[PDB]
Structure 1
Amino acid sequence: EEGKLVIWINGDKGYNGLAEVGKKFEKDTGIKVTVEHPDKLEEKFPQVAATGDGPDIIFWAHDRFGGYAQSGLLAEITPAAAFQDKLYPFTWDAVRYNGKLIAYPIAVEALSLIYNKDLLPNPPKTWEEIPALDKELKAKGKSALMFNLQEPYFTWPLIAADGGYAFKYAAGKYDIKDVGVDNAGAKAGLTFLVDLIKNKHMNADTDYSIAEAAFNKGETAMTINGPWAWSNIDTSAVNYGVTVLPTFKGQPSKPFVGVLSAGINAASPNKELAKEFLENYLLTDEGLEAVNKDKPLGAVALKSYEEELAKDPRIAATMENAQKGEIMPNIPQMSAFWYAVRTAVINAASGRQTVDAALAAAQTNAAAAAQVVADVLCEFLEVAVHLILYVREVYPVGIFQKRKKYNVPVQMSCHPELNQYIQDTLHCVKPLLEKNDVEKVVVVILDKEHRPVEKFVFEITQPPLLSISSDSLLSHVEQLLAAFILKISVCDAVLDHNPPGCTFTVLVHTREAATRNMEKIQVIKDFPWILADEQDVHMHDPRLIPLKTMTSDILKMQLYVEERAHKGSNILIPELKAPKS
């Protein structure tokens, strides 16, 4: 297929205008450009580019391009700095995967505040003034605001405004374990939304069609919707404005941003012709005008042409909200985010869950990787703690039962109260591990005077994780954890025997000031944790015997033992004591 350009774009786009750009490229270069609009484009591309064929260039929403790239279906693109400067800077952050540019940004789309200019000549700038506005409109038989509450796309702008986010983004990559749906900002935003329903300014049942019908018949002063909705309003007799979404706590609302994007098939022999067509023909005022004249593109990523389009203040408003918004992450973990958050908002809004519990459950289900690593650690710490108590003889050998785990032998207590105390401890730690807030977990051995004799220190690092690749990572990790168990089960040969009558406790060192974690760690009723006293932790003259260190993609960990010479603020400890031996 060398010497031609085959382009796939979706049939709702201006593909006849794109074909006209294709013909000016041909006149000037000889290269014939053929534009096609097949069906089910996004699902056909990973099927036919797996064979190595398909188009040289595919146009689609950017969000799918990050999985294309992890499948290696997209070429890396090499625009000069001077060409990048021609597009709005935030649009390049939507076409980056693993730090590398993988597509050209074309058009930008996001939600705006749409408002009826008979009811509301000046739209509110803050979410905070909508309750008072709705009371004034109710006395006129109207309401202030109606938008889809059934879909998290539409409610996210308010949730994300004060600190919520989907996946954390840095250096052109997403950390699939850093999710911001249950942080302080998300909860404030979802609290405000829920309080609007509580105070009867919105109805929790409102959906897309109910919101559109009501705004378009002059019954509600404002709605929140996208450029796909302008058409129906235009023929509705409502005169409407399109403006920036209100601030929340003085912060911009942050709608999800969609970027129409042009990617290059990694299998293509014409990669250089594709770069030239896209950079010097399409991404120009002349080329975008020809597409936009066929079917409007909305706001565009090329600055000079967007300055022309922005004479339509509707388009200016889309671009301004897009600049303040959150680029929709381009990774396959977004599908778990959407299900999780859709249930959270629906549940919280109809009063079927608390806000804290709705989001907490959404956080652990959107950040499935962070749940997986925390559960692997908690299973391991449980196994480790039992084995420590066996090999150091804190409890007699008759309460233990020989078992298999990580393919090495272990020892598991059958003492129900002991097991219950270790599970309570580890269930409280698990949410802190899910947030990567744990620096150290320390199994402490204490003598009859409640002074520390031994400390088994597990130092924990959880590296940022990208969209998972190695299919044997959990298997490789379990071999690394198995070696920790082997070190523990032969560690009596390196440690002096403990004086008789010892007990044990568990310490958590946190990364930051433990006072923020003081609420997150109280997960079990009647099993509180407190800030540790220096008597609880201070070791008199410690000797540091190292035991094991591992490194892997999901977890770096060091196990060492602090032993006292002669045996015979960021620290949390359970209030309760283990059942004595």
Structure 2
Amino acid sequence: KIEEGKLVIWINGDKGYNGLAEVGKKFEKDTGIKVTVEHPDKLEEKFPQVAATGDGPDIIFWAHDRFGGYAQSGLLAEITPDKAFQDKLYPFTWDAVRYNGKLIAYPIAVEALSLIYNKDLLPNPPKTWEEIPALDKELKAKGKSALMFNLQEPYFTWPLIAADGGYAFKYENGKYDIKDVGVDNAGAKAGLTFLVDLIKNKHMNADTDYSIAEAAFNKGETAMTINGPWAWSNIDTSKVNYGVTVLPTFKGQPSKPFVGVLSAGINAASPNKELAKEFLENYLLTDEGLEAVNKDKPLGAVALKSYEEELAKDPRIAATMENAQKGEIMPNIPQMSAFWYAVRTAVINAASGRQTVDAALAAAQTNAAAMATLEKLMKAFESLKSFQQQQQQQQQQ
């Protein structure tokens, strides 16, 4: 059960586990307490499974969206750093770590989407979403394509949708307003309409999957794709002079991408916490800490005001972060799981013809509210299961 007098940390194999085992040594040769990392196949389960009963690691590394469901179930011994530490990094990052208003996890890395172009084919990109049609019939004219991305999925579509008005739930002062779902409103209407007005004017496709997004831009076709840092490696593979800058602005309004903060929280039943304190504080952070991580595997835009600043001399990194300033924190609330499906169906109909813009987005918000039910129910089942299992244990006699 737990640790006591040591310190065990979990982070995903894919992320630079090596920086930790380094700050492990930094810690080991400074306070005299042993730190190690573990990268178990999909810890997502492992953690809340045994963390709920005490045990697991003392600390954890993962995207902030999932932390909600952990903090919801009661796992993170909410953190306490002073103004000094809070001020040491970006204010909007702090908005990404609030459940019931309280702090929970320390924010580490930040991923958001950018505009990747082909300089050999395209100069000074656009800067407004309204330029791209005038681009296409100019470039499609020479046998090419203006733009392409994942139109099949919805994580990718929101950037325009939200650009004007359209949001998920409004937070309104450091929480989430469950009622104030801002889809079928001013912004979403003309947001989505634009896209249908593209596909109907042949500029975009519909069948477009993710492969086709990556594959097409990669072969010098479609000099205009939108993706995140995870494909940056697969552009040196192709070797196509790119790329990466701030997204175009629809209706003057900045495009609105989603933001996923890595960050790290602390198991409540982990007797150490104080050791996670000074360790996470001024060992893990402070250039060096992050330096050591993002070296073995880059983290992209990072929480620390000073460090993100230093490697921002990368024209790619900078642009990602600039999309974070004018973006939406991925709400950690479990309501999001629904929003996905409801919006996913709304995009499949939007330009499918099977339905219309206005009517798709209304039926979606109408359906998104109608999903809480499905959850209230899902949870009711999960509750019957936690009484029925006591009955099952009473059944063996």
TM-score computed with the length of structure 1 as normaliser: 0.63
| CA distance 1:136–1:478, change in 2 (3 Å) | closer
Deviations 1:37-74 (A, max 9, x none): 11111121110111111011000000011111110111
| CA distance 1:353–1:21, change in 2 (3 Å) | same
Deviations 1:93-127 (A, max 9, x none): 01111111110110110110110111111100000
- For residues 29 and 118 of structure 1, the distance between their equivalents in structure 2, rounded to whole angstroms, comes to 53
| CA distance 1:55–1:577, change in 2 (3 Å) | closer
Contact 2:20 2:36 in 1 (8 A): no
| CA distance 1:11–1:576, change in 2 (3 Å) | closer
Q: How does 1:270-285 map to 2 (within 5 A)?
A: 270-285=272-287
- For residues 98 and 84 of structure 1, the distance between their equivalents in structure 2, rounded to whole angstroms, comes to 18
Contact 1:299 1:315 in 2 (8 A): yes
Deviations 1:215-268 (A, max 9, x none): 000111100101001111112131111000100000100100000010000111
Question: What secondary structure does 1:339 align onto?
Answer: helix
Deviation of residue 4 (structure 1)? 0.8
- For residues 96 and 306 of structure 1, the distance between their equivalents in structure 2, rounded to whole angstroms, comes to 22
- What are structure 2's unaligned runs of at least 5 residues? none
- For residues 136 and 273 of structure 1, the distance between their equivalents in structure 2, rounded to whole angstroms, comes to 60
| CA distance 1:570–1:300, change in 2 (3 Å) | closer
Question: What secondary structure does 1:193 align onto?
Answer: helix
Contact 1:63 1:329 in 2 (8 A): yes
Q: How does 1:265-304 map to 2 (within 5 A)?
A: 265-304=267-306
Deviation of residue 365 (structure 1)? 2.0
Q: Which residue of 2 aligns with 1:307?
A: 309
Question: What secondary structure does 1:220 align onto?
Answer: coil
Contact 1:177 1:369 in 2 (8 A): no
Q: 66, 72, 78: which is aligned to 2:74?
A: 72
Percent of aligned pairs with the same residue?
Answer: 94
Deviation of residue 16 (structure 1)? 1.4
| CA distance 1:38–1:578, change in 2 (3 Å) | closer
Deviation of residue 580 (structure 1)? 65
Deviation of residue 23 (structure 1)? 1.0
Deviation of residue 209 (structure 1)? 0.5
Deviations 1:440-473 (A, max 9, x none): xxxxxxxxxxxxxxxxxxxxxxxxxxxxxxxxxx
Contact 1:336 1:365 in 2 (8 A): no
Deviations 1:11-50 (A, max 9, x none): 0011112110111111111111111111111121110111
| CA distance 1:577–1:38, change in 2 (3 Å) | closer
More strand by share: 1
TM-score computed with the length of structure 2 as normaliser: 0.92
| Structure (1 or 2) with the larger CA radius of gyration | 1
| CA distance 1:78–1:482, change in 2 (3 Å) | closer
Q: Which residue of 1 aligns with 2:375?
A: 478
Deviations 1:464-491 (A, max 9, x none): xxxxxxxxxxxxx99999999xxxxxxx
Contact 1:178 1:367 in 2 (8 A): no
2:3 counterpart of 1:187: no
- What are structure 1's unaligned runs of at least 5 residues? 371-476, 485-568
| CA distance 1:315–1:479, change in 2 (3 Å) | closer
Q: Which residue of 2 aligns with 1:153?
A: 155
| CA distance 1:358–1:478, change in 2 (3 Å) | closer
| CA distance 1:191–1:282, change in 2 (3 Å) | same
- For residues 29 and 483 of structure 1, the distance between their equivalents in structure 2, rounded to whole angstroms, comes to 48
* Structure 1 residue ranges, 4+ long, deviating more than 6 angstroms after superposition: 477-484, 569-581
**C-alpha RMSD over aligned residues:** 9.7
Deviation of residue 367 (structure 1)? 2.5
| CA distance 1:134–1:279, change in 2 (3 Å) | same
Contact 1:14 1:292 in 2 (8 A): yes
- For residues 71 and 392 of structure 2, the distance between their equivalents in structure 1, rounded to whole angstroms, comes to 51
Deviation of residue 368 (structure 1)? 3.4
